[PDB]
Ligand binder design. Structure first.
Ligand SMILES: CC(C)CCC[C@@H](C)[C@H]1CC[C@H]2[C@@H]3CC=C4C[C@@H](OC(=O)CCC(=O)O)CC[C@]4(C)[C@H]3CC[C@]12C
Ligand SMILES: CC(C)CCC[C@@H](C)[C@H]1CC[C@H]2[C@@H]3CC=C4C[C@@H](OC(=O)CCC(=O)O)CC[C@]4(C)[C@H]3CC[C@]12C
Ligand SMILES: CC(C)CCC[C@@H](C)[C@H]1CC[C@H]2[C@@H]3CC=C4C[C@@H](OC(=O)CCC(=O)O)CC[C@]4(C)[C@H]3CC[C@]12C
Ligand SMILES: CC(C)CCC[C@@H](C)[C@H]1CC[C@H]2[C@@H]3CC=C4C[C@@H](OC(=O)CCC(=O)O)CC[C@]4(C)[C@H]3CC[C@]12C
Ligand SMILES: CC(C)CCC[C@@H](C)[C@H]1CC[C@H]2[C@@H]3CC=C4C[C@@H](OC(=O)CCC(=O)O)CC[C@]4(C)[C@H]3CC[C@]12C
Ligand SMILES: CC(C)CCC[C@@H](C)[C@H]1CC[C@H]2[C@@H]3CC=C4C[C@@H](OC(=O)CCC(=O)O)CC[C@]4(C)[C@H]3CC[C@]12C
Ligand SMILES: CC(C)CCC[C@@H](C)[C@H]1CC[C@H]2[C@@H]3CC=C4C[C@@H](OC(=O)CCC(=O)O)CC[C@]4(C)[C@H]3CC[C@]12C
Ligand SMILES: CC(C)CCC[C@@H](C)[C@H]1CC[C@H]2[C@@H]3CC=C4C[C@@H](OC(=O)CCC(=O)O)CC[C@]4(C)[C@H]3CC[C@]12C
Ligand SMILES: CC(C)CCC[C@@H](C)[C@H]1CC[C@H]2[C@@H]3CC=C4C[C@@H](OC(=O)CCC(=O)O)CC[C@]4(C)[C@H]3CC[C@]12C
Ligand SMILES: CC(C)CCC[C@@H](C)[C@H]1CC[C@H]2[C@@H]3CC=C4C[C@@H](OC(=O)CCC(=O)O)CC[C@]4(C)[C@H]3CC[C@]12C
Ligand SMILES: CC(C)CCC[C@@H](C)[C@H]1CC[C@H]2[C@@H]3CC=C4C[C@@H](OC(=O)CCC(=O)O)CC[C@]4(C)[C@H]3CC[C@]12C
Ligand SMILES: CC(C)CCC[C@@H](C)[C@H]1CC[C@H]2[C@@H]3CC=C4C[C@@H](OC(=O)CCC(=O)O)CC[C@]4(C)[C@H]3CC[C@]12C
Ligand SMILES: CC(C)CCC[C@@H](C)[C@H]1CC[C@H]2[C@@H]3CC=C4C[C@@H](OC(=O)CCC(=O)O)CC[C@]4(C)[C@H]3CC[C@]12C
Ligand SMILES: CC(C)CCC[C@@H](C)[C@H]1CC[C@H]2[C@@H]3CC=C4C[C@@H](OC(=O)CCC(=O)O)CC[C@]4(C)[C@H]3CC[C@]12C
Ligand SMILES: CC(=O)N[C@@H]1[C@@H](O)[C@H](O)[C@@H](CO)O[C@H]1O
Ligand SMILES: *[C@@H]1O[C@H](CO)[C@@H](O)[C@H](O)[C@H]1NC(C)=O
Ligand SMILES: *[C@@H]1O[C@H](CO)[C@@H](O)[C@H](O)[C@H]1NC(C)=O
Ligand SMILES: *[C@@H]1O[C@H](CO)[C@@H](O)[C@H](O)[C@H]1NC(C)=O
Ligand SMILES: *[C@@H]1O[C@H](CO)[C@@H](O)[C@H](O)[C@H]1NC(C)=O
Length: 926
């Protein structure tokens, strides 16, 4: 084909070649990306929330692998199974005055409130609950088969006040009851409220120290413990004029689980939840996460509206459909090419649901690039209106391709910085967004200028409804002038005239941000446990169950408030190595057994026994009065040997006669005898959790695990949990340094999964900050070449972070997973506005501060404002969503927009006006 002597001439001369080449290369990526890599799945929205490389993580996955692999013939067995061959060679309640069970979690249940009225205790509300149960749940066909029935005729009653009250007044059903029953039951509860709080009127009855009449169907306990707000009856029960019920819970005689999915979708999901007298306000059918997949897809409309509005804006700004359509096509196609790269070339086997949320980011920064290019192109068409097309292209690129790089590169580098995190979902998201930004940048340099050539080559030729078009052209020209004089005079006037106000005002706002984030109420690590994470909008009937009602109903409030000790576990022979893929959350290593290990050497037998007793002196050991003969198994073996009198040839190696550091071989024999005996000397059977030795397929000892209870208690609170971990690990890790060989390389673990996420979120955040700020500062130097300007730019950027993070703290964000990503992103999104003002301030020909800033503002203000405004409106478009991440990104985009725009237009322009380098002293040579 024909040859042009320059790239800017290839654009001018054969732009169609560029478009053909690019559309080909999009479409082959679309094809391979659809065909070859398996489709992403969000049926588990938590899937990659897992720190990997962390020492606690490697220990945990190793331990988890041991539990998984332990079992009969398989590797790392729990008994000496080869030796275990040798031992073989050697409805109407006034009849139906009972419930099919006492309810619990594991049943499907709902929580009622009322839209008005101060107590649910009134008869109409009671009847409303049993009515709406019938009308929403029992009315469904499938329920009749889901039921924990006793007969087909009427399968089983639910648990609700409406049923207990009936039995307690010998009525047939909820529909028969009267306010005499309600008052009589209220008298029962007001009498029996005191007994229940003590626990004297306990769960099992029909208790013993309490009047039998209070507890005849065992009912009172169940009512107060399951059905009713813990605040309904209290020590103030009689101090209340009448007790007030804010909430009640109702239990279906059907499972909490996937089986409910139809009934929810059928009868709950899009009802107004109400009869006014009552409202369902919490629901737990268990389907919370399994519904997510479907919900995410319903919400993608909001992203689609965001794109449709970003189109409209770019049309109005560019005065063409065509440039706006082909830019939008480029923006979209970059997600396809990057998706191809991410699955195929980079060979990542997993794609977090979060990556879809990067679309709404990338359309914002896509429009940002489109603005500065079309703007500078139009500057060339004004600065040099008569030009040859390739020359005009060249000078446009000489200007724009640099600035449009550093918008993009700083933002990509902020997303790739999240690859430093130990968390797989974050590392993946940080890479996908990073590539899609850079792919989009390449299209904005190759594809887009070719379209600008086509626009001048052809598209100007094409030209009541007959005049309303002209009305609009007139009016939009009027705003083009009003906006022009606003930027070219008014905004500079505002900034200079009140410079001193703007400086202290924004400065105080940053201190507010810094105080809020860093001291009070300090930015907090997540403290709902992972298996209960929020995924829907906080108003949503599922989220209110985990968020509010688990605090309020006694069985929940107690069961999740109960004390459990940390099972301090210590392990040897298995190495603490994770050999899985550090990005694919489906992958894990197997075991890796260590040839240096043994226990049968008498030196080991001595040291390990001694070590348990040393482990028994440490302050953190909870010395139970109950004795676990599997904790420190070797003691149990020692005393068993000592109990073993000898009167047979077979028992000579296992004689009590021998000194405790036994010969390795007789240890290796007698240990098998002792443990295989445990099926007979006790009824207890081992399982994969059970402490003790562990076996080869041919029952050499390959490993051993010991376990002990802490003084400490299980908690989600990072500080207390950290105190526990650091103490116990430090002591064990020190003490192991004393051990004879092979025991030299043990390690410790216990129920620490949620702690390791918290500890990995803070470090993963902070380091991705330090990295993203460092790169953002380097770009600031490399563009402005003036250390003074860069210092101010960095101060303003830092200020935006403190105000955004501070306001997100006040909005009540934990440092949970998505949120902890966004904080790095904020650095990338913030920096580019300060870069634009920075370069324009140097490029000002004016000799003085005021001239320099006036030039910078008048030159950039429109394009900056569009970048902010488009991103902001795209963000706002996510607000109506139902999925939390969509709304969470939404708030964040709006907020970081205003804040970064405000600091970049005001504060940064004070520091230039009020302190800017007008002498050359801040400048550095190439
Ligand atoms: C993502 C995909 C759908 C993008 C596909 C790009 C097309 C819409 C572009 C590529 C080349 C363009 C064409 C290049 C040349 C011409 C010839 C031109 O015809 C004339 O009458 C003038 C001919 C001349 O003197 O050059 C009108 C515009 C048109 C059809 C252009 C219309 C838009 C086209 C087909
Ligand atoms: C809620 C939204 C969807 C309604 C309002 C949006 C309009 C004000 C936008 C949408 C597309 C835009 C148009 C895209 C392309 C052109 C071609 C161009 O046509 C000409 O004949 C040149 C006239 C001139 O510039 O003087 C003039 C601008 C115009 C009408 C744009 C003006 C502003 C428009 C009508
Ligand atoms: C970066 C963006 C622009 C692209 C990201 C990849 C998408 C092309 C993937 C992500 C999730 C996928 C969806 C996940 C689930 C479903 C339900 C599925 O429903 C069925 O009836 C088939 C069920 C099955 O066999 O899996 C149809 C495909 C679809 C929409 C998938 C189509 C391809 C999707 C949209
Ligand atoms: C990873 C790959 C696929 C990206 C490829 C993109 C390039 C083809 C783009 C990026 C920036 C563009 C450049 C932006 C600015 C200029 C400067 C301009 O002027 C000079 O080079 C003057 C040199 C002199 O001083 O003599 C000529 C076009 C050129 C190189 C552009 C040509 C096309 C470039 C190299
Ligand atoms: C893997 C991909 C994403 C990397 C792509 C990087 C390039 C697009 C960068 C690297 C070096 C940059 C170039 C370094 C130096 C120059 C010379 C510069 O020449 C000028 O005339 C400067 C003075 C002036 O603007 O008047 C114009 C921009 C240009 C080509 C830069 C444009 C953007 C470039 C090609
Ligand atoms: C907008 C335009 C300029 C396209 C974007 C350019 C690049 C960002 C992409 C597009 C297709 C990619 C290529 C697709 C296929 C291959 C084959 C691949 O071959 C190997 O032997 C891979 C071995 C392996 O690592 O497994 C090497 C990378 C390469 C050239 C890729 C490098 C990056 C490319 C050039
Ligand atoms: C609920 C949703 C559907 C509401 C959508 C409202 C938008 C259509 C409004 C909100 C803000 C408006 C914008 C406010 C500021 C500007 C900048 C203004 O810029 C200039 O006039 C530049 C003139 C030039 O230099 O050529 C053009 C109109 C525009 C994009 C406005 C067009 C109409 C916008 C996008
Ligand atoms: C480089 C400067 C000039 C600009 C600002 C960037 C960072 C220094 C800021 C942004 C977000 C802040 C972080 C937000 C959240 C946390 C988690 C927080 O973790 C805790 O365990 C707090 C106590 C608890 O949760 O009980 C410790 C501080 C830290 C890293 C903050 C410290 C200061 C950070 C890293
Ligand atoms: C993904 C990798 C390739 C990124 C590497 C870091 C980039 C941010 C660096 C690499 C080369 C640098 C460029 C090398 C040379 C120059 C020329 C230098 O002087 C001029 O051209 C003056 C232009 C003007 O007056 O603004 C301006 C900075 C610039 C574009 C540098 C900007 C920052 C660049 C693109
Ligand atoms: C006042 C001027 C300066 C304009 C400010 C921006 C507005 C154009 C838009 C953008 C985002 C919008 C808000 C986005 C979300 C909501 C939440 C919505 O309320 C709820 O979701 C909470 C209901 C509850 O639980 O009480 C009420 C409208 C509101 C405040 C919107 C009101 C109009 C806002 C501020
Ligand atoms: C002018 C520019 C800035 C764009 C304006 C976008 C608006 C069209 C958005 C911003 C806030 C949105 C509102 C934010 C919150 C809600 C509550 C939401 O309440 C529900 O019942 C659904 C959620 C639930 O199930 O709890 C219904 C949509 C609505 C009114 C949204 C409708 C669309 C609004 C007004
Ligand atoms: C002149 C304008 C364009 C500049 C100032 C912009 C503000 C009006 C924006 C920036 C951030 C926005 C907020 C970002 C996040 C939220 C949370 C959102 O949800 C709730 O507040 C739910 C909980 C509650 O109701 O307390 C409601 C909208 C709100 C306050 C937004 C309202 C509009 C705000 C304050
Ligand atoms: C969403 C966040 C990131 C803020 C984005 C920047 C806005 C604050 C800018 C963009 C366009 C600006 C507007 C452009 C033009 C005008 C007309 C201007 O009109 C006059 O001064 C009066 C003229 C007369 O005499 O009739 C008043 C300010 C206003 C609304 C500007 C107010 C500030 C705006 C909305
Ligand atoms: C353009 C300039 C002025 C900077 C950007 C606008 C800020 C001043 C906005 C952006 C987000 C706003 C915050 C968004 C959410 C909230 C939560 C809201 O509720 C609470 O703090 C309740 C406190 C309590 O219960 O006592 C009060 C307003 C506040 C702090 C807002 C205060 C004003 C903020 C920081
Ligand atoms: C109603 C009831 O059982 N009250 C008991 C009370 O008699 C006892 O003194 C106290 C300490 O156990 O616990 C409560
Ligand atoms: C309860 O109802 C039954 C009839 O269904 C009746 O025999 C009985 O006397 C009633 N009263 C009591 C206290 O059980
Ligand atoms: C909607 O909610 C109100 C709450 O008062 C309730 O009265 C009404 O019956 C519900 N359903 C319909 C169809 O209006
Ligand atoms: C410390 O442990 C040894 C056995 O390891 C025991 O004899 C000694 O009494 C313990 N000391 C204290 C203070 O508990
Ligand atoms: C015993 O098991 C080990 C590892 O499982 C294996 O290498 C060895 O060959 C086995 N020996 C016999 C005799 O089964």
């Amino acid at each position: 084909f024909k040859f042009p002597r320059s790239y800017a001439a290839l654009l001018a001369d054969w732009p169609v070649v560029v478009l053909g080449m690019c559309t080909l290369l999009i479409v082959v990526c679309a094809l391979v990306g659809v065909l070859v890599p398996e489709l992403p799945d969000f049926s588990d929205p938590l899937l990659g929330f897992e720190p990997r490389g962390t020492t606690i993580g490697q220990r945990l996955v190793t331990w988890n692998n041991m539990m998984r692999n332990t079992g009969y013939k398989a590797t790392l067995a729990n008994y000496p199974y080869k030796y275990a061959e040798e031992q073989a060679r050697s409805w109407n309640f006034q009849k139906d005055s009972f419930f099919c069970d006492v309810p619990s979690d594991g049943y499907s249940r709902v929580v009622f409130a009322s839209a008005g009225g101060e107590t649910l205790w009134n008869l109409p509300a009671i009847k409303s609950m049993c009515d709406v149960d019938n009308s929403r749940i029992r009315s469904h066909p499938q329920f009749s088969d889901l039921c924990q029935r006793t007969t087909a005729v009427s399968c089983c009653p639910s648990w609700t006040l409406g049923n207990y009250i009936a039995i307690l007044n010998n009525r047939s059903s909820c529909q028969k009851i009267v306010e005499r029953d309600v008052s009589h039951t209220l008298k029962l509860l007001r009498t029996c409220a005191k007994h229940y709080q003590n626990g004297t009127l306990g769960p099992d009855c029909w208790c013993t120290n309490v009047p039998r009449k209070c507890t005849k169907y065992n009912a009172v306990y169940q009512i107060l413990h399951y059905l009713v707000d813990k605040d309904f009856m209290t020590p103030k029960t009689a101090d209340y004029a009448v007790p007030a019920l804010k909430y009640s819970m109702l239990f279906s005689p059907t499972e909490k689980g996937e089986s409910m999915m139809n009934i929810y979708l059928d009868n709950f999901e899009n009802w107004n939840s109400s009869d006014g007298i009552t409202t369902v306000t919490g629901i737990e059918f268990g389907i919370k996460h399994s519904l997510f997949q479907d919900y995410l897809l319903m919400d993608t409309v909001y992203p689609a509206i965001a794109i449709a509005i970003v189109l409209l804006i770019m049309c109005v700004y560019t005065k063409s459909m065509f440039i706006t359509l082909m830019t939008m096509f480029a923006i979209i196609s970059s997600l396809i090419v990057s998706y191809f790269l991410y699955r195929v070339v980079f060979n990542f086997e997993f794609f977090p649901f979060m990556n879809l949320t990067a679309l709404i980011i990338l359309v914002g920064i896509g429009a940002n690039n489109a603005f500065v290019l079309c703007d500078v192109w139009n500057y060339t068409k004004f600065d040099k209106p008569r030009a040859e097309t390739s020359e005009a292209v060249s000078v446009t690129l000489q200007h724009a391709a640099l600035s449009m790089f550093v918008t993009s590169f700083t933002t990509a580098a902020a997303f790739y910085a999240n690859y430093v995190s130990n968390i797989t979902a974050i590392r993946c998201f940080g890479v996908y967004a990073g590539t899609a930004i850079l792919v989009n940048y390449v299209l904005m340099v190759t594809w887009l200028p070719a379209v600008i050539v086509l626009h001048e080559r052809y598209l100007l030729n094409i030209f009541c409804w007959a005049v309303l078009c002209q009305k609009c052209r007139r009016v939009l020209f009027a705003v083009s002038e009003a906006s022009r004089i606003f930027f070219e005079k008014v905004l500079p006037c505002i900034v200079i005239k009140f410079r001193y106000l703007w400086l202290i005002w924004f400065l105080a706002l940053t201190v507010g941000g810094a105080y809020i984030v860093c001291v009070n109420p300090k930015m907090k690590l997540p403290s709902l446990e992972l298996s209960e994470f929020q995924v829907f909008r906080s108003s949503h009937p599922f989220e209110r169950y985990d968020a509010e009602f688990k605090k309020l109903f006694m069985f929940e409030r107690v069961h999740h408030g109960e004390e459990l000790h940390m099972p301090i576990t210590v392990i040897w022979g298995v190495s603490p190595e994770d050999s899985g893929d550090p990005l694919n959350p489906k992958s894990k290593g197997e075991l890796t057994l260590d040839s240096t290990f043994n226990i049968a050497s008498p030196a080991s037998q001595a040291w390990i026994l001694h070590f348990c007793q040393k482990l028994r002196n440490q302050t953190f050991f909870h010395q139970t009065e109950q004795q676990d003969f599997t904790s420190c198994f070797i003691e149990t073996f020692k005393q068993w040997m000592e109990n073993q009198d000898c009167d047979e040839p077979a028992l000579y190696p296992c004689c009590s006669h021998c000194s405790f550091p036994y010969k390795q071989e007789v240890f290796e024999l007698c240990i098998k005898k002792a443990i295989m005996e445990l099926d007979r000397s006790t009824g207890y059977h081992l399982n994969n959790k059970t402490p003790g030795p562990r076996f080869d397929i041919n029952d050499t000892i390959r490993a051993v695990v010991l376990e002990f209870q802490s003084t400490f208690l299980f908690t989600l609170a990072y500080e207390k949990m950290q105190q526990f971990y650091k103490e116990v690990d430090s002591w064990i890790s020190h003490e192991l340094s004393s051990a004879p060989e092979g025991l030299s390389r043990g390690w410790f673990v216990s129920n620490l999964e949620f702690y390791d996420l918290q500890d990995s979120l803070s470090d993963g955040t902070l380091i991705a900050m330090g990295l993203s700020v460092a790169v953002a500062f380097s770009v600031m130097l490399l563009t402005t070449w003036n250390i003074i300007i860069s210092l101010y730019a960095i101060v303003s950027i830092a200020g935006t972070i403190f105000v955004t993070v501070g306001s997100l703290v006040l909005l009540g964000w934990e440092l949970n997973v998505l949120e902890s990503v966004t904080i790095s992103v904020a650095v990338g999104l913030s920096v580019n506005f300060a870069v634009h003002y920075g370069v324009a301030y140097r490029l000002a020909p004016d000799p003085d501060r005021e001239g320099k800033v006036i030039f910078s503002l008048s030159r950039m203000g429109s394009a900056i404002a569009m970048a902010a405004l488009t991103t902001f409106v795209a963000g706002a478009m996510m607000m109506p969503s139902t999925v939390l991440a969509y709304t969470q990104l939404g708030t964040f985009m709006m907020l970081v927009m205003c804040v970064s725009w405000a600091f970049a237009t005001f504060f940064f322009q004070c520091l230039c006006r009020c302190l800017g380098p007008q002498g050359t002293c801040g400048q550095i040579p190439f």
